[PDB]
Amino acid sequence: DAFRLIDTGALINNLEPRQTTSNTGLLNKANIQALIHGLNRHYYSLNIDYHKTAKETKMLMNLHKEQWQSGLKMYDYEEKEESNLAATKSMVKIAEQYSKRIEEEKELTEEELKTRYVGRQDPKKHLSETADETLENNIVSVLTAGVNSVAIK
Amino acid sequence: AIRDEIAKNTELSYDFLPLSNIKALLFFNNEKETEKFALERNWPIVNSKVYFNNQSKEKADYEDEMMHEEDQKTNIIEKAMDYAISIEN
């Protein structure tokens, strides 16, 4: 947050709402929500934007985008699997129970064509929770098979 | 056509056998005519020289022919795991 002194904001001083993104303060919510309209003094009209040059653009892409994987290659694949060796066999088995235990609870509401247990949001609970679980199993299946694959005798 | 049928199975099942079973089981009349069938693929009959007559050798290193293979390519094996890429996207 920056600050710009408006001096006398009574009548005919200058037009702040021109440059970029002005006329904020909808209802009582602005930033911390305690400032609302008047903000600090005579509506200093906070606006801040960033920029990147040609050198700063290639620097961030080669350093930090989401996580830093650069500088070394096959270690990030193996070390993630090696530390998880006892965990992967466990996580596949542990999440195997919790996957069906959710399917064995909310899914039983909708069975026949008519209404029995009066399912409402129950059939949609086990669908969204187990949607990523079936995806994570396919991801670790390729990673576990891919690292040991690709040559290395 | 009969002699081109029986001995196909003798490859895996029968480990060894002398010339007596060749004349009896396969019903061959004249001697040294089997030697004419022994020419190219080298038949020292002593134990098992087969795979000349009755199909062919076992070769080795089968890759890049039909569908899935064993030794060199894991890609088509991985293609089954990569088949879900086009289905999900």
Side-chain angles (χ1 to χ4, degrees), chain A residues 16-23 45-47 49:
Chain A
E16 295 83 357
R18 183 171 65 254
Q19 183 179 356
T20 302
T21 58
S22 179
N23 290 283
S45 179
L46 172 61
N47 189 32
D49 187 5

mmCIF file with all atom_site columns, all heavy atoms in Angstrom, chain A residues 16-23 45-47 49:
data_model
loop_
_atom_site.group_PDB
_atom_site.id
_atom_site.type_symbol
_atom_site.label_atom_id
_atom_site.label_alt_id
_atom_site.label_comp_id
_atom_site.label_asym_id
_atom_site.label_entity_id
_atom_site.label_seq_id
_atom_site.pdbx_PDB_ins_code
_atom_site.Cartn_x
_atom_site.Cartn_y
_atom_site.Cartn_z
_atom_site.occupancy
_atom_site.B_iso_or_equiv
_atom_site.pdbx_formal_charge
_atom_site.auth_seq_id
_atom_site.auth_comp_id
_atom_site.auth_asym_id
_atom_site.auth_atom_id
_atom_site.pdbx_PDB_model_num
ATOM 1  N N   . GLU A 1 16 ? -8.388  12.313 -9.565  1.00 0.00 ? 16 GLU A N   1
ATOM 2  C CA  . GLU A 1 16 ? -7.718  11.033 -9.339  1.00 0.00 ? 16 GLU A CA  1
ATOM 3  C C   . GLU A 1 16 ? -8.302  9.920  -10.202 1.00 0.00 ? 16 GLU A C   1
ATOM 4  O O   . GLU A 1 16 ? -7.522  9.192  -10.840 1.00 0.00 ? 16 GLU A O   1
ATOM 5  C CB  . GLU A 1 16 ? -7.749  10.680 -7.848  1.00 0.00 ? 16 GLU A CB  1
ATOM 6  C CG  . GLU A 1 16 ? -6.953  11.626 -6.959  1.00 0.00 ? 16 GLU A CG  1
ATOM 7  C CD  . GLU A 1 16 ? -7.731  12.871 -6.579  1.00 0.00 ? 16 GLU A CD  1
ATOM 8  O OE1 . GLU A 1 16 ? -8.879  13.025 -7.049  1.00 0.00 ? 16 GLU A OE1 1
ATOM 9  O OE2 . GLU A 1 16 ? -7.195  13.697 -5.811  1.00 0.00 ? 16 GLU A OE2 1
ATOM 10 N N   . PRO A 1 17 ? -9.640  9.716  -10.273 1.00 0.00 ? 17 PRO A N   1
ATOM 11 C CA  . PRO A 1 17 ? -10.161 8.580  -11.049 1.00 0.00 ? 17 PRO A CA  1
ATOM 12 C C   . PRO A 1 17 ? -9.937  8.689  -12.549 1.00 0.00 ? 17 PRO A C   1
ATOM 13 O O   . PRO A 1 17 ? -10.899 8.813  -13.314 1.00 0.00 ? 17 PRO A O   1
ATOM 14 C CB  . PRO A 1 17 ? -11.662 8.599  -10.725 1.00 0.00 ? 17 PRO A CB  1
ATOM 15 C CG  . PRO A 1 17 ? -11.762 9.296  -9.425  1.00 0.00 ? 17 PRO A CG  1
ATOM 16 C CD  . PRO A 1 17 ? -10.714 10.358 -9.493  1.00 0.00 ? 17 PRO A CD  1
ATOM 17 N N   . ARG A 1 18 ? -8.678  8.650  -12.985 1.00 0.00 ? 18 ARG A N   1
ATOM 18 C CA  . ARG A 1 18 ? -8.381  8.578  -14.410 1.00 0.00 ? 18 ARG A CA  1
ATOM 19 C C   . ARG A 1 18 ? -7.406  7.447  -14.712 1.00 0.00 ? 18 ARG A C   1
ATOM 20 O O   . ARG A 1 18 ? -7.724  6.552  -15.501 1.00 0.00 ? 18 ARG A O   1
ATOM 21 C CB  . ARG A 1 18 ? -7.842  9.908  -14.942 1.00 0.00 ? 18 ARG A CB  1
ATOM 22 C CG  . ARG A 1 18 ? -7.600  9.858  -16.440 1.00 0.00 ? 18 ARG A CG  1
ATOM 23 C CD  . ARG A 1 18 ? -7.277  11.212 -17.064 1.00 0.00 ? 18 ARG A CD  1
ATOM 24 N NE  . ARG A 1 18 ? -6.022  11.804 -16.614 1.00 0.00 ? 18 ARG A NE  1
ATOM 25 C CZ  . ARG A 1 18 ? -5.940  12.833 -15.779 1.00 0.00 ? 18 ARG A CZ  1
ATOM 26 N NH1 . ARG A 1 18 ? -7.044  13.384 -15.291 1.00 0.00 ? 18 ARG A NH1 1
ATOM 27 N NH2 . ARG A 1 18 ? -4.753  13.310 -15.428 1.00 0.00 ? 18 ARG A NH2 1
ATOM 28 N N   . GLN A 1 19 ? -6.213  7.500  -14.113 1.00 0.00 ? 19 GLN A N   1
ATOM 29 C CA  . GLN A 1 19 ? -5.103  6.621  -14.471 1.00 0.00 ? 19 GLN A CA  1
ATOM 30 C C   . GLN A 1 19 ? -5.484  5.149  -14.580 1.00 0.00 ? 19 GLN A C   1
ATOM 31 O O   . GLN A 1 19 ? -5.578  4.616  -15.691 1.00 0.00 ? 19 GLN A O   1
ATOM 32 C CB  . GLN A 1 19 ? -3.977  6.754  -13.444 1.00 0.00 ? 19 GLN A CB  1
ATOM 33 C CG  . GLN A 1 19 ? -2.749  5.927  -13.775 1.00 0.00 ? 19 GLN A CG  1
ATOM 34 C CD  . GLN A 1 19 ? -1.643  6.103  -12.762 1.00 0.00 ? 19 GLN A CD  1
ATOM 35 O OE1 . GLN A 1 19 ? -1.756  6.903  -11.833 1.00 0.00 ? 19 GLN A OE1 1
ATOM 36 N NE2 . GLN A 1 19 ? -0.564  5.351  -12.934 1.00 0.00 ? 19 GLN A NE2 1
ATOM 37 N N   . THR A 1 20 ? -5.690  4.477  -13.448 1.00 0.00 ? 20 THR A N   1
ATOM 38 C CA  . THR A 1 20 ? -6.014  3.057  -13.478 1.00 0.00 ? 20 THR A CA  1
ATOM 39 C C   . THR A 1 20 ? -6.800  2.671  -12.231 1.00 0.00 ? 20 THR A C   1
ATOM 40 O O   . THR A 1 20 ? -6.509  3.159  -11.134 1.00 0.00 ? 20 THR A O   1
ATOM 41 C CB  . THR A 1 20 ? -4.737  2.212  -13.592 1.00 0.00 ? 20 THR A CB  1
ATOM 42 O OG1 . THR A 1 20 ? -4.014  2.591  -14.769 1.00 0.00 ? 20 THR A OG1 1
ATOM 43 C CG2 . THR A 1 20 ? -5.069  0.734  -13.685 1.00 0.00 ? 20 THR A CG2 1
ATOM 44 N N   . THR A 1 21 ? -7.781  1.780  -12.414 1.00 0.00 ? 21 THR A N   1
ATOM 45 C CA  . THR A 1 21 ? -8.520  1.107  -11.344 1.00 0.00 ? 21 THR A CA  1
ATOM 46 C C   . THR A 1 21 ? -8.907  2.028  -10.193 1.00 0.00 ? 21 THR A C   1
ATOM 47 O O   . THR A 1 21 ? -8.358  1.915  -9.092  1.00 0.00 ? 21 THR A O   1
ATOM 48 C CB  . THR A 1 21 ? -7.720  -0.082 -10.798 1.00 0.00 ? 21 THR A CB  1
ATOM 49 O OG1 . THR A 1 21 ? -6.445  0.363  -10.320 1.00 0.00 ? 21 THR A OG1 1
ATOM 50 C CG2 . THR A 1 21 ? -7.528  -1.140 -11.876 1.00 0.00 ? 21 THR A CG2 1
ATOM 51 N N   . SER A 1 22 ? -9.846  2.933  -10.431 1.00 0.00 ? 22 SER A N   1
ATOM 52 C CA  . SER A 1 22 ? -10.327 3.841  -9.404  1.00 0.00 ? 22 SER A CA  1
ATOM 53 C C   . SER A 1 22 ? -11.798 3.554  -9.103  1.00 0.00 ? 22 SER A C   1
ATOM 54 O O   . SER A 1 22 ? -12.385 2.595  -9.618  1.00 0.00 ? 22 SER A O   1
ATOM 55 C CB  . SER A 1 22 ? -10.109 5.290  -9.837  1.00 0.00 ? 22 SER A CB  1
ATOM 56 O OG  . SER A 1 22 ? -10.593 6.187  -8.853  1.00 0.00 ? 22 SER A OG  1
ATOM 57 N N   . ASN A 1 23 ? -12.385 4.391  -8.243  1.00 0.00 ? 23 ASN A N   1
ATOM 58 C CA  . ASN A 1 23 ? -13.783 4.258  -7.825  1.00 0.00 ? 23 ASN A CA  1
ATOM 59 C C   . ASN A 1 23 ? -14.027 2.926  -7.121  1.00 0.00 ? 23 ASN A C   1
ATOM 60 O O   . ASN A 1 23 ? -15.051 2.271  -7.326  1.00 0.00 ? 23 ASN A O   1
ATOM 61 C CB  . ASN A 1 23 ? -14.740 4.437  -9.007  1.00 0.00 ? 23 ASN A CB  1
ATOM 62 C CG  . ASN A 1 23 ? -14.783 5.867  -9.511  1.00 0.00 ? 23 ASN A CG  1
ATOM 63 O OD1 . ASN A 1 23 ? -15.414 6.732  -8.905  1.00 0.00 ? 23 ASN A OD1 1
ATOM 64 N ND2 . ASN A 1 23 ? -14.110 6.122  -10.628 1.00 0.00 ? 23 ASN A ND2 1
ATOM 65 N N   . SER A 1 45 ? -6.627  7.088  -3.326  1.00 0.00 ? 45 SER A N   1
ATOM 66 C CA  . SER A 1 45 ? -6.827  6.215  -4.485  1.00 0.00 ? 45 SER A CA  1
ATOM 67 C C   . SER A 1 45 ? -5.614  5.306  -4.712  1.00 0.00 ? 45 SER A C   1
ATOM 68 O O   . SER A 1 45 ? -4.819  5.488  -5.637  1.00 0.00 ? 45 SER A O   1
ATOM 69 C CB  . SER A 1 45 ? -7.143  7.040  -5.738  1.00 0.00 ? 45 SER A CB  1
ATOM 70 O OG  . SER A 1 45 ? -7.308  6.206  -6.870  1.00 0.00 ? 45 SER A OG  1
ATOM 71 N N   . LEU A 1 46 ? -5.485  4.326  -3.819  1.00 0.00 ? 46 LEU A N   1
ATOM 72 C CA  . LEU A 1 46 ? -4.402  3.354  -3.915  1.00 0.00 ? 46 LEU A CA  1
ATOM 73 C C   . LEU A 1 46 ? -4.449  2.597  -5.237  1.00 0.00 ? 46 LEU A C   1
ATOM 74 O O   . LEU A 1 46 ? -5.468  1.992  -5.586  1.00 0.00 ? 46 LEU A O   1
ATOM 75 C CB  . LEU A 1 46 ? -4.473  2.368  -2.750  1.00 0.00 ? 46 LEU A CB  1
ATOM 76 C CG  . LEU A 1 46 ? -3.499  1.191  -2.872  1.00 0.00 ? 46 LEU A CG  1
ATOM 77 C CD1 . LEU A 1 46 ? -2.054  1.671  -2.896  1.00 0.00 ? 46 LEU A CD1 1
ATOM 78 C CD2 . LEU A 1 46 ? -3.723  0.176  -1.757  1.00 0.00 ? 46 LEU A CD2 1
ATOM 79 N N   . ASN A 1 47 ? -3.336  2.631  -5.967  1.00 0.00 ? 47 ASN A N   1
ATOM 80 C CA  . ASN A 1 47 ? -3.124  1.782  -7.130  1.00 0.00 ? 47 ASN A CA  1
ATOM 81 C C   . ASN A 1 47 ? -1.657  1.385  -7.175  1.00 0.00 ? 47 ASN A C   1
ATOM 82 O O   . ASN A 1 47 ? -0.781  2.242  -7.023  1.00 0.00 ? 47 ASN A O   1
ATOM 83 C CB  . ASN A 1 47 ? -3.521  2.489  -8.427  1.00 0.00 ? 47 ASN A CB  1
ATOM 84 C CG  . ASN A 1 47 ? -3.507  1.560  -9.622  1.00 0.00 ? 47 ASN A CG  1
ATOM 85 O OD1 . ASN A 1 47 ? -3.785  0.367  -9.500  1.00 0.00 ? 47 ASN A OD1 1
ATOM 86 N ND2 . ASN A 1 47 ? -3.161  2.098  -10.783 1.00 0.00 ? 47 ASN A ND2 1
ATOM 87 N N   . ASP A 1 49 ? 0.956   -1.455 -9.446  1.00 0.00 ? 49 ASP A N   1
ATOM 88 C CA  . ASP A 1 49 ? 1.152   -2.477 -10.463 1.00 0.00 ? 49 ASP A CA  1
ATOM 89 C C   . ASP A 1 49 ? 2.642   -2.757 -10.586 1.00 0.00 ? 49 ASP A C   1
ATOM 90 O O   . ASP A 1 49 ? 3.474   -1.889 -10.314 1.00 0.00 ? 49 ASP A O   1
ATOM 91 C CB  . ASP A 1 49 ? 0.571   -2.040 -11.818 1.00 0.00 ? 49 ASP A CB  1
ATOM 92 C CG  . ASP A 1 49 ? 0.613   -3.145 -12.860 1.00 0.00 ? 49 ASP A CG  1
ATOM 93 O OD1 . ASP A 1 49 ? 1.006   -4.282 -12.521 1.00 0.00 ? 49 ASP A OD1 1
ATOM 94 O OD2 . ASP A 1 49 ? 0.255   -2.873 -14.026 1.00 0.00 ? 49 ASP A OD2 1
#
